[PDB]
């Protein structure tokens, strides 16, 4: 005796430490923490890693997390800095303080961005080269193909995000306005993230999956009520809230948590978020952008292709084009 | 037809909006949000309210929360400002940006504090005069009896908090050092919150509830390993992390969430946190301070009284005394 | 000292025992237990009651439940027999071993049924006359209005059930056949429970809420694949499985759990299950039957009215009629 | 177009079906289903398998399970019969209708048992030779070493079970009698399963982890209250309930669910259940029996060794011995 309490390490199997799984966030900050909580809270960690190019906040941030320890069931969580540890993995996510611009049109850029994302990513990928990446930063499209490309494997590893978010916005208010329920009810959006963001009025329905078109009778902008105004307001909704920002995070992260949950577990479900644009609804070049799709086991398997074709089609279509158009030039690390 | 979709309000019961339950936070900020997440996340809202003497953050803060909406199941959450709405309730909690001092000994004060807590509390209590209050702010003791008193009903409504926190700290590290498990294992602390914080080595055990005293053989400070150093470090642990603060929140709130969960549901369990000090282990006057106890349905029912009596007894005992001693004077709204 | 451990009952508030809420099952058996598990498991008990006109199974049944105790968080669960205790409530459910007939068309009857349900119900209602009742037994319609009527309050208290079940059946297989996801995807059924059960092909869609009609092109029975055969098989699906029965229960109860969850919490959502048939889609007399609707706080608030009108309309319509037609006579306690 | 809806299989990664994980039950029946529910309900399936030497119940049983489908999130569950599929795994459990004897002392046997377990096990092990086995059947000890042995790897793969169960029994009643809480409070048992089952009064405590010995003052059987009678009753408690049995299952399975949860995730915690008896508290030969221990990642890592030594020591000690003594002969496939 001596060592402490009965037995000593071995006694059965032995020295090792095998999670099976594992995950991580490069948003140890707001989105990070928001993410962390949702994640540390829901139910997902067989093993979890957290980290950034920060030494301080890290120390402090984890302390609250680590301490909570006994309130949530997640045995292990590592903190440190560079990109060695995290390896043990599957799902990894990076933000990188730059984000928006604080005003309007999500970061047209990639320019000084290439830098910010790169020295972080190519590190993580090597260590757990066998994972999928959730890339967030304004124009999700832009980076998804940026990350995917420099990173490693088209539609298997690269998942942007967006959409689910806009839908939520689209849905709650409207629903509430309509006069209904949180859970059921339905209808989507297509494309990017503000300054275009195009909705589908072709399927908007209520706790049926019947039709609100036959009823409230079509037209948008020639009726007052203002269906049109509704979706615009929303874009604004995503927009202004300039007074308070990292609460974009609360929900943002929440959404991401939902996605990861969705992706991590393998539900074969459905979620927007920009991946490939090659199902069989031809799109002008590399393409890139959203479209409702289903995620699982390794990343995604199948996107859902279609719509009416009344300008909205173009609305959706043209946006992607116009930017790459100019991006062509702007793009080049 | 016209109104929209089939039926119209009535059809069954009718006009009303009856949660059954309900709750709230005056920490719409850090602790607030930290709290909010844990809460909005775990599983507790049949109906939820959030608010402060803030107009802005509020707007922004809720947006992320409200939007998440579809990711968590909590039908309704109200934002607004003063203290009318929230009424619908049971559990309510207030922080109030003042908190610490950023350096060491938790806010000796109450002075300019009386103000900060009062114009908030006496409002809420009237509207949902039928609730229990979780008061947090450095010297939990100090305010619990302050809130309780001006507020309404001794050991039925006033619950400080502390302890569980210190235990967690006490436990994880130690356990890890020991070489064991997150969940089982055990041993407590008594008193206040730093600069005394006294532990019980009289019951510290491991996944048995047997004894580590018989083994690692007693003494503290005459052995090197440094059991003593261990608990001190912890106090420091709670202490320094001055680089990053609101992560005190992450865990702080987490803990509070645990408590509320515990209290809200009615588990008849056990949790430190300062209430009455009159079980039958006589304490010098009004008294106030912690001691492991059991919470339920309306607040608490029963505290757990006891220890060895070797100076530690005094350690615990004397602290409370010395402050009231001086507080006597300092106390008086 | 003496009594045991520190303090004694009072010390704060005092003698009382106040859940806030509470619920119960008269299917202490299969459905009962199935129900119990789902319920004891998910997250719903602030306070729970279970009981029947059984003394034995009760004793035994609860033991496993009660013992699990420490694995799930549900402080209290009472067993006993008659109908005094349970009072403390909101949601109560009765089955009553008679159920089917073991062969085909769900219990045409009510005859010897009136008896089986009555001596149980009018008891419970008085004690917790302030609740809502989930009545299950073949022809849900039949009894809902039977229970509701003798019981107390039309569309406020009486909720049959059915539908969600048929949808599930409708959906999984089909979806799987289609080649898709568990969660998203959609389309419903209307009416009763087998031997008619009419689906809506007018809204069947996939992870869009777009349209599968425009595509797989209409017709049913003039195409081979056999959309038609599909829904029939399902009815059969509900049907045969005569080899094993109480697994109808597993899912049955699961479904009921989903419903109650839905109802208990107040989600303002959507769920079939037969209530009132008076939205504003006139139905021949008392009426009774399903139709997707939204449940909440006290029972239901609003049903969703509509369809195409191609025979299917009649299909749905006529069934209800024909039975009441004959029921008229058969009905009379 | 034609196939149905947009895109076709590939589009990203491709043809494959990779869970990551997976699990199974050979108690498709009572314990099985009880297990299934707890499991299908809590949160554990990235991928799940269920099966037995039954064709019928299987068909029926799964139907309820499969249908529930949309109520719980567990994408895939396979049914079929022999032992090919399940392979994909980690944790597997077998019961095998024989179980008790319906009267008293848990199945002294192994005799006709060897048969019942063998033709099932050696099948599963080959396919997912990389797992851990939860063996249940009266004398857990007996089979654990039986399964382990013929099966494959001592203390790495073989986990009996028992104990947690007895503790629960020990705890609830007592606690309730005491007058306290579901969650906190503590004290254990050692050995086997009835007709000896020896408790530790050396650590029995209350929401402290302090001491009830110093207080209610020692002795058992020389005091009336009847601490002694208490634990006996319990054994009886496990015993009689002969009127109703498979509710032993409800809890039994629940407990097993708790264990698996514990084991599956890797909490490094603590749980009785018989494994190795070689920590360093020497036990007469092969040994076998319980003792509180910690489970994780691959099975278990470390058991907790100790007690007083007053006859109880012998009580515990001797039982194991006496049976092997005779078993020696009886043992031999
Ligand atoms: N996907 C979305 O929906 C989304 C939305 C929004 C807001 C508007 C949105 O469209 C909506 O409709 O609601 C924003 N974002 C993106 O989220 C990122 C996170 O933003 P944040 O909350 O501001 O995180 P942060 O504070 O920038 O970063 C904090 C931590 O980041 C690390 N960090 C900071 N700088 C750097 C660096 N140079 N290198 C490495 N790490 C760091 C450090 O660990 C910090 O503590 C954001 O991208 C936003 O656009 C996404
Ligand atoms: N109970 C604890 O364990 C605890 C610990 C700690 C840190 C150290 C701790 O002992 C430990 O060991 O970990 C701190 N606290 C207390 O938590 C309070 C919350 O701190 P916070 O995260 O800093 O919240 P905040 O930012 O002060 O407040 C933000 C919001 O508060 C409102 N607010 C601010 N000022 C005022 C006002 N004058 N009136 C009304 N509302 C506001 C507004 O809504 C803000 O958005 C803190 O008290 C700390 O001591 C408790
Ligand atoms: N709502 C449904 O979907 C549903 C479906 C089905 C099967 C087919 C279905 O349409 C489907 O598509 O899947 C059946 N049911 C109804 O569920 C009831 C429960 O059936 P069960 O599992 O058979 O419960 P039980 O064994 O009859 O009853 C066991 C306990 O009932 C009590 N009990 C028994 N007899 C009496 C009595 N005379 N008075 C009071 N209590 C009892 C005792 O406590 C028993 O232990 C069933 O109604 C079925 O039709 C509903
Ligand atoms: N670990 C425990 O705590 C435990 C306790 C108890 C009761 C007393 C207990 O000590 C206590 O304190 O509460 C019992 N058990 C063991 O659980 C086993 C399950 O019992 P069950 O609920 O009776 O399952 P079952 O009905 O026997 O089996 C049903 C299915 O088993 C398969 N099956 C049946 N026979 C055979 C076969 N010959 N080969 C293969 N499969 C099957 C088929 O799929 C059935 O549908 C039980 O072992 C009990 O002792 C464990």
**Both tokens assigned to D326:** 């005779």
Resolution (A): 2.7
d(CA C288, CA C276): 6
Contact D178 C38 (CB under 8 A): no
Q: Which residues, in sequence order, are bridge partners of residue B91?
A: B23, B132
Q: Where does D102-245 have alpha helices with state H?
A: 111-118, 121-127, 140-151, 154-157, 164-178, 227-239
- Which residue minimizes the CA distance to atom 41 of ligand 3? C96
Cβ–Cβ contacts within 10 Å for residue A80, how many?
Answer: 14
Question: Closest residue of C to B298, CA-based?
Answer: C13
**Quick count: other Cβ atoms within 10 Å of Cβ A129?**
13
DSSP C42: H
What tokens were used for D310? 């007053």
Indicate if D149 and D179 belong to the same structural domain.
no
Min Cα distance B273 → chain D (Å) is: 14
Neighbouring-strand partners of residue B94: B135
D12: which strand partners? A301
Backbone φ/ψ region at A102: left (φ over 0), alpha (ψ -120 to 50), beta: left
Q: Indicate the pairing of strand A48-50 with strand B48-50.
A: unpaired
Q: Judge contact between B167 and B189, C-beta under 8 A.
A: yes
For position C264, which CATH number holds?
Answer: 3.90.110.10
Beta strands A189-190 and B91-94: pairing type?
A: unpaired
- Residue minimizing CA distance to atom 4 of ligand 2: B252
Q: Which residues contact A128 (CB under 8 A, 6 or more apart)?
A: A22, A86, A87, A88, A89, A90, A92
Quick one: which H or E segment has residue A166?
A: helix A164-178
Active-site residue (options: D181, D193, D231, D271): D193
Contact list in B for residue C304 (CB cut-off 8 A) is: 5-7
- What does DSSP say about strands A158-159 and A293-296: parallel, antiparallel, or unpaired? unpaired
Q: Ligand 1 centre from A252 Cα, in Å? A: 9
Nearest in space to C167 (alpha carbons), one of D36, D69, A205: D69
Decide: D293 in ligand 4 pocket, CB within 6 A: no
B252: nearest Cα among B273, B275, B224, B225: B273
Asked if B8 lies within 8 A of C267 by C-beta distance, the reply is no
CA-based nearest residue to B61, from A241, A193, D176: A241
Beta bridge partners of C140: none
For residue A5, the enclosing domain spans 1-162
DSSP letter string, D48-89? EEE--S-SHHHHHHHHHHHHHGGGS----EE--SSSSGGGS-
Sequence-distant (≥ 6) Cβ neighbours of residue B13 within 8 angstroms: C153, C155, C156, C298, C299, C300, C301
Q: How far is CA C227 from CA B300, C96, C172, C177, C203, in A?
A: 61, 36, 14, 11, 14
**φ, ψ of residue A84 in degrees (nearest 5):** -90, -65
Structure-block tokens of residue B170: 């006490």
d(CA D272, CA D259) in angstroms, rounded, equals: 10
CA distances from A200 to A142, A167, A205, A291 (A): 23, 10, 11, 11
* Radius of gyration of chain B, Cα coordinates, nearest whole angstrom: 22
Experimental technique? X-ray
CB atoms within 10 A of CB D55: 11
| A152 shares a domain with A174 | no
Nearest to A190, CA basis, from A330, A319, A59: A319
Cβ A279 vs Cβ D11: under 8 Å: yes
- Pick from B27, B49, B236 the residue to mutate for probing ligand 2's pocket: most ligand atoms within 8 Å of its CB: B27
**Domain match, B111 and B201 both:** no
- Is-contact C65 C228, C-beta < 8 A? no
The DSSP code for A205 is B
B133 membership: H or E segment, kind and range: strand B132-135
Tokens encoding A22:
């594992």
- Assign A144 to helix, strand or coil: helix
- H/E segment holding residue C44: none
Ligand-binding site membership of D12 (annotated): no
Q: How far apart are CA C133 and CA C141, in angstroms?
A: 13
Q: Using a 6 Å cutoff on CB, does residue A160 contact ligand 1?
A: no
CB A124 within 8 A of CB A99: no
Q: Do D302 and A9 touch (CB under 8 A)?
A: yes
Q: C68: which 2 tokens?
A: 């699990």
Q: For B12, which DSSP code?
A: B
Residues B195 and B91 reside in one and the same domain: no
Cβ–Cβ under 8 Å, residues D4 and A280: no
- Give the residue among C20, D79, A306 at the shortest CA–CA distance from B264: C20
Residues 6 or more apart whose Cβ sits within 8 Å of residue C81: C51, C52, C53, C54, C55, C58
Closest CA to C72 of A219, D254, D114: D254
Last residue of a domain, one of A135, A162, A189: A162
Q: Do B244 and A57 touch (CB under 8 A)?
A: yes
Which residue's CA is minimally distant from atom 43 of ligand 2?
A: B29
β-pair partners for B300: B295
What backbone phi and psi angles, to 5 degrees, belong to A93? -135, 135
Query: Could you tell me which residues come within 8 angstroms of residue D277 by beta carbon, excluding any fewer than 6 positions away?
Result: D283, D287, D288, D289, D291, D303, D320
Distance from the C129 Cα atom to the nearest Cα atom in chain D, whole angstroms: 30
How many residues are there in chain A?
A: 333
How many Cβ atoms sit within 10 Å of the Cβ of residue B6?
Answer: 23
Give the end of a domain, one of A115, A141, A162: A162
Q: Which of B15, B83, B9, B20 is nearest to B48 (CA)?
A: B20
Q: Is the dihedral of CA C67, C69, C72, C76 positive or negative?
A: positive
How buried is residue D5: exposed, middle or buried, by Cβ count under 10 Å (0-12/13-18/19+)?
buried
CA distances from B279 to B144, B191, D214 (A): 17, 15, 18
Beta strands in A118-217 (DSSP E): 132-135, 158-159, 189-190, 198-199
Do B153 and B191 lie in one domain? The reply is: no
C54 Cα nearest atom in ligand 3: 44
Q: How many CB atoms lie within 10 A of CB B247?
A: 26
Give the dihedral sign, CA A167/A169/A175/A178. negative
How many whole angstroms separate alpha carbon A29 and alpha carbon A249?
Answer: 10
Mind telling me how many Å the CA of A323 is from chain C's nearest CA? 27
Please report where in the chains the tokens 């010395």 appear, as a residue: B322
**Residue C91, CB-side half-sphere exposure with 13 Å CA sphere:** 27
Half-sphere exposure of A122 (CA within 13 A, CB side): 9
- Final residue of a domain: which of D100, D127, D162? D162
Give nearest CA residue, ligand 4 atom 50.
D99
**Phi, psi dihedral angles at B297 (to 5 degrees):** 5, -40
Q: How far apart are CA C328 and CA B113, in angstroms?
A: 73
Residues B329, B219 share a domain: yes
CA nearest to B270, candidates B288, B296, B252, B251: B296
- DSSP notation for B27-81: --SHHHHHHHHHHHHHS--SSEEE--S-SHHHHHHHHHHHHHGGGS----EE--S
CA Rg value for chain D? 22
Q: Cα(C204) to centroid of ligand 2, in Å?
A: 51
Task: Give the Å distances, CA to CA, from D292 to A297, B328, D163, D309.
Answer: 37, 51, 8, 17
Give A213-219 contacts, CB < 8 A, sequence gap 24+: A215/B1, A215/B4, A215/B5, A216/B4
Q: Going by CA atoms, what residue is nearest to atom 29 of ligand 4? A: D29
**Tokens at residue D122, please?**
């050696």
Half-sphere exposure of C62 (CA within 13 A, CB side): 17
Q: Could you tell me which residues come within 8 angstroms of residue A170 by beta carbon, excluding any fewer than 6 positions away?
A: A187, A188, A189, A199, A231, A234
- Looking at the structure of chain B, the number of domains it has is 2
What is the distance in angstroms between the CA of the first residue and the CA of the last residue of chain A?
A: 62
Are A8 and A82 within one domain?
yes
Q: Residue D48, annotated ligand binder?
A: yes
Let me know whether D155 and D211 are in one domain: no
> Is B274 within 8 Å of B140 (Cβ atoms)?
yes
Q: Are A87 and A228 in the same domain?
A: no
D17 phi and psi, to 5 degrees? -170, 85
Contact D299 A12 (CB under 8 A): yes
Same domain as B133, residue B84: yes
Cα dihedral across residues D249, D250, D253, D258: positive or negative? negative
The span from the CA of A133 to the CA of A143, in Å, is: 11
Alpha-carbon gap, residue D150 to C144, rounded angstroms = 57
- Are the C-beta atoms of A145 and A288 separated by less than 8 Å? yes
Closest residue of C to B297, CA-based?
A: C18
Q: Count of CB atoms within 10 A of residue B243's CB?
A: 13
Distance (Å) from CA C100 to ligand 3 centroid: 8
C193 is catalytic: yes
Q: Dihedral of the CA atoms B211, B217, B221, B227 (nearest 10)? A: -40
DSSP B269: -
Same domain, C149 and C242: no
Contact partners, residue B137, CB within 8 Å, separation at least 6: B95, B96, B98, B99, B107, B113, B117, B143
- Chain D residues within 8 A of A275 when measuring between CB atoms: 12
Residue A119 and residue A22 share a domain: yes
| φ/ψ of residue A180, rounded to 5 | -150, -135
Looking at CA atoms only, how far is residue B200 from chain D in angstroms? 9
What's the CATH number where D148 sits? 3.40.50.720
Q: Is B164 in the pocket of ligand 2 (CB under 6 A)?
A: no
3-state secondary structure of A228: helix
Interface contact flag, A12 D301, Cβ < 8 Å: yes
Nearest ligand for residue C238 CA: 3
């Amino acid at each position: 005796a001596t060592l402490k309490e009965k037995l000593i390490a071995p006694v059965a199997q032995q020295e090792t430490t095998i999670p099976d799984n594992k995950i991580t966030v490069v948003g140890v900050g707001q989105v990070g923490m928001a993410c962390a909580i949702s994640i540390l809270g829901k139910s997902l960690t067989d093993e979890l890693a957290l980290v950034d190019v920060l030494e301080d906040k890290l120390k402090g941030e984890m302390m609250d997390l680590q301490h909570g320890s006994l309130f949530l069931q997640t045995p292990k969580i590592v903190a440190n800095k560079d990109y060695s540890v995290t390896a043990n993995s599957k799902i990894v996510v990076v933000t990188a303080g730059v984000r928006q611009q604080e005003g309007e049109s999500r970061l047209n850029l990639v320019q000084r961005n290439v830098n910010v994302f790169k020295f972080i990513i190519p590190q993580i990928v090597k260590y757990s080269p066998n994972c999928i990446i959730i890339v967030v930063s304004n124009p999700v499209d832009i980076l998804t193909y940026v990350a995917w490309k420099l990173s490693g494997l088209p539609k298997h590893r690269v998942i942007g995000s967006g959409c689910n978010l806009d839908s939520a916005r689209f849905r709650y208010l409207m629903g509430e306005k309509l006069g209904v329920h949180p859970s059921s009810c339905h209808g989507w959006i297509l494309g990017e993230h503000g300054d275009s963001s195009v909705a589908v009025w072709s399927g908007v329905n209520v706790a049926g999956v019947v039709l609100q078109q036959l009823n409230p009778e079509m037209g948008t902008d020639n009726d007052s009520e203002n269906w049109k105004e509704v979706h615009k307001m929303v874009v604004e909704s995503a927009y202004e809230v300039i007074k308070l920002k990292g609460y974009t995070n609360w929900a943002i992260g929440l959404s991401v948590a939902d996605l990861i949950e969705s992706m991590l577990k393998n539900l074969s479900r459905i979620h927007p978020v920009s991946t490939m644009v090659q199902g069989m609804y031809g799109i002008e070049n590399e393409v890139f952008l959203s479209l409702p799709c289903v995620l699982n086991a390794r990343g995604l398997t199948s996107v859902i292709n279609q719509k009416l074709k009344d300008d909205e089609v173009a609305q959706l279509k043209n946006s992607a084009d116009t930017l790459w158009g100019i991006q062509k030039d702007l793009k080049d690390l």
